[PDB]
Design an enzyme around this catalytic site. Structure first.
Site, PDB file in Angstrom:
ATOM      1  N   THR A 113      41.121  37.235  43.102  1.00 38.74           N
ATOM      2  CA  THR A 113      42.184  37.851  42.301  1.00 38.74           C
ATOM      3  C   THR A 113      42.899  39.004  42.993  1.00 38.74           C
ATOM      4  OG1 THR A 113      41.401  37.161  40.129  1.00 38.74           O
ATOM      5  CG2 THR A 113      42.547  39.286  40.269  1.00 38.74           C
ATOM      6  N   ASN A 157      31.228  40.109  38.189  1.00 38.23           N
ATOM      7  CA  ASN A 157      32.509  40.820  38.258  1.00 38.23           C
ATOM      8  C   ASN A 157      32.880  41.652  37.031  1.00 38.23           C
ATOM      9  OD1 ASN A 157      35.780  39.787  39.580  1.00 38.23           O
ATOM     10  ND2 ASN A 157      34.710  41.769  39.452  1.00 38.23           N
ATOM     11  N   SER A 193      32.343  34.346  42.907  1.00 32.75           N
ATOM     12  CA  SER A 193      32.804  35.232  41.862  1.00 32.75           C
ATOM     13  C   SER A 193      32.500  36.683  42.179  1.00 32.75           C
ATOM     14  CB  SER A 193      32.168  34.839  40.531  1.00 32.75           C
ATOM     15  OG  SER A 193      31.364  35.892  40.030  1.00 32.75           O
ATOM     16  N   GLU A 207      29.903  25.455  41.180  1.00 28.97           N
ATOM     17  CA  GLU A 207      28.873  26.364  40.705  1.00 28.97           C
ATOM     18  C   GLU A 207      27.806  25.564  39.977  1.00 28.97           C
ATOM     19  N   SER A 225      36.092  39.758  35.799  1.00 29.03           N
ATOM     20  CA  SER A 225      36.031  38.335  36.061  1.00 29.03           C
ATOM     21  C   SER A 225      37.158  37.510  35.429  1.00 29.03           C
ATOM     22  CB  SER A 225      34.664  37.799  35.596  1.00 29.03           C
ATOM     23  OG  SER A 225      34.321  36.588  36.258  1.00 29.03           O
ATOM     24  N   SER A 226      37.867  36.738  36.240  1.00 28.58           N
ATOM     25  CA  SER A 226      38.938  35.892  35.736  1.00 28.58           C
ATOM     26  C   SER A 226      38.278  34.700  35.046  1.00 28.58           C
ATOM     27  CB  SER A 226      39.808  35.404  36.896  1.00 28.58           C
ATOM     28  OG  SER A 226      40.046  36.463  37.805  1.00 28.58           O
ATOM     29  N   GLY A 274      35.299  28.043  42.286  1.00 22.21           N
ATOM     30  CA  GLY A 274      34.845  26.819  42.923  1.00 22.21           C
ATOM     31  C   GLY A 274      33.601  26.225  42.296  1.00 22.21           C
TER      32      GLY A 274
HETATM   33  N1  LIG Z   1      40.996  44.060  48.550  1.00 25.48           N
HETATM   34  C1  LIG Z   1      40.209  44.796  47.737  1.00 25.48           C
HETATM   35  N2  LIG Z   1      40.262  46.177  47.805  1.00 25.48           N
HETATM   36  C2  LIG Z   1      39.490  46.965  47.005  1.00 25.48           C
HETATM   37  N3  LIG Z   1      38.642  46.377  46.124  1.00 25.48           N
HETATM   38  C3  LIG Z   1      38.529  45.016  45.999  1.00 25.48           C
HETATM   39  C4  LIG Z   1      39.323  44.164  46.822  1.00 25.48           C
HETATM   40  N4  LIG Z   1      39.018  42.915  46.499  1.00 25.48           N
HETATM   41  C5  LIG Z   1      38.084  42.943  45.535  1.00 25.48           C
HETATM   42  N5  LIG Z   1      37.783  44.234  45.227  1.00 25.48           N
HETATM   43  C6  LIG Z   1      36.781  44.728  44.192  1.00 25.48           C
HETATM   44  O1  LIG Z   1      35.858  43.712  43.762  1.00 25.48           O
HETATM   45  C7  LIG Z   1      36.187  43.272  42.438  1.00 25.48           C
HETATM   46  C8  LIG Z   1      36.282  41.746  42.371  1.00 25.48           C
HETATM   47  O2  LIG Z   1      37.482  41.294  42.989  1.00 25.48           O
HETATM   48  P1  LIG Z   1      38.173  39.999  42.336  1.00 25.48           P
HETATM   49  O3  LIG Z   1      39.407  39.591  43.055  1.00 25.48           O
HETATM   50  O4  LIG Z   1      38.439  40.199  40.885  1.00 25.48           O
HETATM   51  O5  LIG Z   1      37.100  38.839  42.416  1.00 25.48           O
HETATM   52  P2  LIG Z   1      37.247  37.315  42.067  1.00 25.48           P
HETATM   53  O6  LIG Z   1      36.981  36.545  43.504  1.00 25.48           O
HETATM   54  O7  LIG Z   1      36.226  36.907  41.061  1.00 25.48           O
HETATM   55  O8  LIG Z   1      38.650  37.109  41.590  1.00 25.48           O
HETATM   56  C9  LIG Z   1      37.441  44.006  42.039  1.00 25.48           C
HETATM   57  O9  LIG Z   1      37.425  44.384  40.655  1.00 25.48           O
HETATM   58  C10 LIG Z   1      37.442  45.237  42.923  1.00 25.48           C
HETATM   59  O10 LIG Z   1      36.743  46.359  42.353  1.00 25.48           O
HETATM   60 MG   LIG Z   2      39.130  36.351  39.674  1.00 23.23          MG
END
Ligand SMILES: Nc1ncnc2c1ncn2[C@@H]1O[C@H](COP(=O)(O)OP(=O)(O)O)[C@@H](O)[C@H]1O
Ligand SMILES: [Mg+2]
Ligand SMILES: [Ca+2]
Ligand SMILES: [Mg+2]
Lengths: 138, 153, 766
Positions: free
Chosen positions: C169, C211, C164, C426, C214-215, C424
């Protein structure tokens, strides 16, 4: 020998009191007493029976020589000793030798052990086998 | 099963020993090792005890009658080839060029397997006259060859 | 190429026997140079500070030569060990490169900063490019899945996994944004798709310690393609939304994003439509934990969320129905109390108002639910929450159905490309129904990932011509799956336990042991703490990736929704058109069952592509690495049953010492060793470049390896014992004589002094 003999004679002389060129039960008994305690009849008897016939200076040197026969050199023995004197110091550590004789090979006995060390020349822990090889030999 | 000239050899040596721990036609079971070690063989301590050996003197003495089978025994036991000693020694060579350091070799002998007193080590080192270079390393190949050679080659 | 488009995308004295990886506490692994061996105690020097230390020999890790610095594909490295991998990644990462391949897996390390690598400039260059042709990138993974679906004529799919806060996402969105920008034929289909995220994220995301966004629901989105290979539709599936965040939020955490958007004043005009005072710290249901969120402008997000409802094609009433029902919730929690009586009515009306029902008939069916049955002071405040939660759940579900309405263009579909963004396995201090659901989910996913790993397996049992046969696999997996899903399973028990109003946390707990205690070994009484603060546990499950102690308290209402069947009648005929539908005319577990099976038969009809996200640290700051955490993720990604594989070169070196009296080529030497050992042809296999040993066998070879090596060492010590003995043999014959001299020659001089003759002689002497 030649000096071993010279003594033998001069000896036989002092022993043969009745200066008759022969050694008799009275000859032995005689001189013994003039010095230290003497043997009892039985001792004197079997002491002579050790010589087939009359004791001229011959049967004398005969039994004496047949005693001192069956032994090794002062060199042969001093070596059988240095055979445990690795460093070649001309001395054996007392605990060592005592240990060897005591329970190794043809084990000695306490008496053999005491009789042996009553004379032994040990001073500083080390038992000088040279001086002792002489003492036991010439 | 041994041959006569063979059993005679056991006899020969049995004496030299049975004599030194007080001649009486009996040998201290604690020496049964060294006895056989004289007739060529080199059993392992694990090996010897298996047939009758003992950890200490006095523990017990043995005749020549019981001795025959101890040697019949310590015969059928595995002896290490040159291959084996070379193999095992390789596992300590990171370089792969037949070397090792004194210090480590010492460790292998004294620390691993049926250990070896620190004395037997300085011993055989001096005997075989093993020598290290400037970096303090030794060709374990040479060493193994000497030990294998014998005291008189 | 000096090309601006590749700035953060293209990669800019070694002794293979001295240099290695040695464990570290700060860096995870340290660059070391060996100094001296000593059995097992190796002494190395740390290249960095130049300090020194010892390290077990079996703790050293093989280093790779500078030849593979910042390598784009790790499968091409000489050494693929936890220390070579962590080094390669961390090398790239601290240089801007966050994407790296390793076989068929793509690795994304969270940047925690915006990167100019997703532009349209860059997308142009990745189009139709084959993975080896251009730097590693997520576009490449997407672009390739497209080509496969097209040429191979089959459905594709990307499972983007990670912890997480990793990037699941963000990366899922970039994939869609990508596929939308190259397979493109209110706004356009493509435009709506991209626009469905802003609304779903507002309603199903929230700030968490891990996060900030967080989704809180699982997302599977399929993107359909037509006969010319262009986007011709799309649908969304969601899983397990966190019903609990609605009314409760642990410290340092926020409720869903909307609630805060709604109280910012992005659209003052709406304040009176929702009846809200633009202050979030005013509503209990959303000011428990946090209020604001470093780097989230609720004002602008609200606007964009509003803007997105339009593009999605939402009538103004529809999108005002949403906003009101959610603002209604904000008030449900303002209704104070004192059988119980009210403590006012101002706030309880605004609620009835927005939901188009009589405030009277409401508080009535809420304080004495109807045959009547009054409720106490808490039975109420808790049914209030039961209502808030249940509304919001229905809202979220209806919301998705609607956004699919906009996307299910009845156009012609050929194949599709799904994207999976789910949380996944946890294990926490305290685990309940929520977790069992996520875990049960990940288990069935595992079987999937395994089914595929096993297929690549056999791709090897042929690249070396070593066909294996029937092995022993996932039986423990199916055992767990079944314990939970099958006819009398855990869930089925719970499901049949809900339908009974009599039931409780104990009849459920007992009814469980009653069925699986001792009749299924996966089900085991709660063990003993393996982490402090370990809350209650009623039973344990042995999940693929861990043993989980589950507390079943409250699982009955969690699964069934405890709202006054009374109020469900009120709302059943409410004035608002949305509210009426939500409570119009099968519990969590039951819905999720049908749901999971749907996703599975879907996934099993695809050719999967895996992306693995990785959170660099717990600080949310960019370019900084926390090796422990990293390593920890690398731990068990993408084992357990597959035969052992060994390159004859490394095999000969390690197992020669097991038959050296048969070793005079690495491939024949082993042919010999394993032959000598009279090894069963069964427990192993040929190979061109490597040996294949059935399971366990290699463990057993390391057994014999240790034993033989010890013996041999003894045998050489025996040899040394026998040499020294025999060496001193002359010295023992000479002394045997030299002693007999002394012993026999002292006994003489002894007996000569005990001779009368000699005695008397000695006497005369002088
Ligand atoms: N490719 C990326 N480029 C810039 N920032 C990222 C990227 N991926 C993740 N982040 C940063 O980290 C945070 C968490 O990413 P996210 O995809 O929401 O996590 P999760 O695996 O829980 O879905 C985002 O809000 C963002 O600030
Ligand atoms: Mg997410
Ligand atoms: Ca004896
Ligand atoms: Mg006279």
């Amino acid at each position: 020998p030649q000096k071993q003999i010279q003594e033998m004679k001069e000896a036989f002389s002092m022993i043969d009191v009745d200066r008759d060129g022969f050694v008799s039960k009275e000859d032995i008994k005689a001189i013994s007493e003039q010095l230290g305690r003497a043997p009892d009849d039985k001792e004197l008897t079997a002491m002579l029976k050790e010589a087939p016939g009359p004791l001229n200076f011959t049967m004398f040197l005969s039994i004496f020589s047949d005693k001192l026969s069956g032994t090794d050199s002062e060199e042969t023995i001093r070596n059988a000793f240095a055979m445990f004197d690795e460093q070649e110091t001309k001395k054996l550590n007392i605990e060592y030798i005592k240990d060897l004789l005591e329970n190794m090979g043809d084990n000695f006995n306490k008496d053999e052990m005491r009789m042996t060390f009553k004379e032994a020349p040990v001073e500083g822990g080390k038992f000088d086998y040279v001086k002792f090889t002489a003492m036991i030999k010439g | 099963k041994l041959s006569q000239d063979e059993i005679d050899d056991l006899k020969d040596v049995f004496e030299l020993f049975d004599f030194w721990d007080g001649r009486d036609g009996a040998v201290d079971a604690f020496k049964l090792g060294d006895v056989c070690r004289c007739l060529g063989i080199n059993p392992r301590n694990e090996d010897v005890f298996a047939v009758g050996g003992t950890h200490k003197m006095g523990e017990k003495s043995l005749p020549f009658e019981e001795f025959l089978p101890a040697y019949e025994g310590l015969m059928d036991c595995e002896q290490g080839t040159f291959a084996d000693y070379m193999e095992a020694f390789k596992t300590f060579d990171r370089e792969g060029q037949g070397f090792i350091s004194g210090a480590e070799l010492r460790h292998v002998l004294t620390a691993l397997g049926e250990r070896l007193s620190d004395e037997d080590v300085d011993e055989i080192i001096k005997l075989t006259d093993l020598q290290e270079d400037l970096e303090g390393n030794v060709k374990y190949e040479d060493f193994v060859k000497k030990v294998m050679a014998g005291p008189y080659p | 190429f000096s090309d601006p488009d590749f700035q953060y995308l293209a990669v800019d004295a070694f002794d293979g026997k001295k240099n290695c990886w040695v464990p570290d506490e700060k860096e995870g692994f340290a660059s070391a140079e060996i100094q001296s061996s000593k059995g097992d105690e190796i002494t190395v020097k740390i290249v960095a500070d130049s300090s020194t230390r010892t390290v077990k020999k079996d703790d050293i890790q093989s280093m790779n030569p500078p030849k593979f610095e910042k390598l784009e594909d790790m499968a091409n490295m000489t050494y693929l060990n936890e220390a070579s991998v962590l080094y390669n990644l961390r090398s790239r990462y601290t240089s801007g490169l966050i994407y790296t391949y390793s076989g068929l897996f793509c690795i994304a390390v969270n940047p925690y900063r915006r990167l100019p690598i997703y532009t349209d400039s860059v997308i142009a260059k990745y189009r139709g490019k084959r993975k080896t042709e251009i730097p590693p990138h997520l576009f490449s993974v997407a672009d390739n899945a497209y080509q496969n679906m097209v040429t191979d004529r089959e459905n594709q799919s990307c499972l983007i996994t990670g912890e997480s806060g990793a990037g699941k996402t963000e990366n899922t969105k970039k994939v869609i944004m990508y596929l939308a920008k190259v397979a493109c034929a209110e706004g356009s289909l493509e435009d709506q798709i991209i626009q469905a995220n802003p609304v779903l994220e507002a309603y199903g995301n929230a700030k968490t310690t891990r996060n900030n966004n967080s989704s809180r629901f699982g997302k599977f989105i399929r993107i359909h393609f037509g006969p010319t290979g262009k986007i011709a539709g799309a649908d969304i599936e969601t899983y397990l939304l966190e019903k609990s965040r609605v009314t409760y939020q642990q410290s340092a955490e926020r409720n869903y994003h909307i609630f805060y958007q709604i109280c910012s004043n992005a659209i003052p005009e709406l304040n009176d439509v929702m009846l809200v005072t633009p202050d979030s710290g005013l509503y209990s249901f959303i000011n428990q934990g946090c209020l604001t969120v470093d780097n989230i402008d609720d004002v602008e997000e609200f606007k964009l969320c509003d803007e997105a409802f339009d593009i999605l094609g939402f009538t103004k009433e529809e999108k005002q129905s949403m906003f009101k029902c959610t603002a209604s919730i904000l008030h449900m929690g303002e209704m104070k109390f004192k059988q119980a009586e009210s403590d006012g009515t101002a706030e309880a009306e605004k609620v009835a108002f927005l939901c188009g029902i009589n405030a009277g008939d409401l508080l009535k069916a809420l304080l004495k639910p109807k045959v009547t049955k009054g409720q106490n002071m808490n039975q109420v405040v808790n049914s209030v929450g039961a209502l808030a939660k249940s509304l919001y759940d229905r809202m979220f579900n209806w919301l998705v159905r609607r956004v699919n309405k906009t996307l299910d263009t009845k156009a012609k579909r050929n194949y599709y490309i799904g994207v999976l963004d789910i949380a996944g396995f946890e294990i926490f201090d305290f685990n309940s129904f929520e977790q069992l659901c996520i875990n049960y989910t990940n288990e069935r996913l595992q079987q999937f990932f395994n089914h595929h790993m096993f297929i690549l397996e056999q791709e090897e049992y042929k690249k070396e011509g070593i066909a294996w046969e029937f092995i022993d696999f996932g039986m423990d997996l199916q055992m767990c799956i079944d314990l939970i899903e099958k006819p009398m399973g855990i869930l089925s028990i719970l499901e049949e336990e809900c339908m009974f109003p009599k039931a409780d946390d104990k009849s459920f707990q007992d009814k469980l042991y009653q069925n699986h205690m001792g009749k299924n070994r996966m089900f085991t009484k709660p063990g003993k703490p393996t982490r402090p603060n370990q809350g209650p546990a009623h039973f344990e499950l042995h999940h693929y990736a861990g043993n989980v102690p589950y507390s079943i308290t409250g699982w009955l209402e969690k699964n069934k929704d405890p709202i006054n069947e009374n109020v469900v009648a009120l709302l059943g005929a409410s004035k608002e058109p949305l509210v009426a539908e939500l409570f119009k005319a099968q519990t969590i577990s039951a819905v999720h069952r049908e749901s999971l099976n749907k996703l599975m038969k879907n996934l099993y009809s695809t050719h999967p592509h895996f992306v693995r996200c990785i959170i660099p640290n717990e600080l949310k700051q960019p370019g900084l690495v926390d090796a422990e955490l990293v390593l920890h993720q690398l731990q068990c990604n993408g084992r357990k049953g597959f035969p052992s594989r060994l390159i004859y070169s490394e095999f000969k070196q390690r197992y020669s010492i097991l038959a050296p009296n048969a070793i005079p080529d690495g491939k024949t030497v082993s042919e010999k060793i394993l032959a000598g050992l009279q090894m069963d042809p069964a427990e192993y296999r040929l190979g061109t470049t490597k040996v294949f040993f059935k399971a366990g066998v290699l463990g057993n070879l390391e057994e014999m390896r240790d034993e033989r090596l010890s013996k041999i060492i003894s045998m050489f010590q025996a040899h040394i014992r026998g040499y020294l003995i025999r060496k001193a043999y002359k010295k023992l014959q000479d002394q045997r004589i030299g002693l007999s001299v002394i012993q026999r020659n002292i006994r003489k001089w002894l007996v000569l002094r005990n001779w009368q003759w000699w005695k008397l002689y000695s006497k005369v002497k002088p």
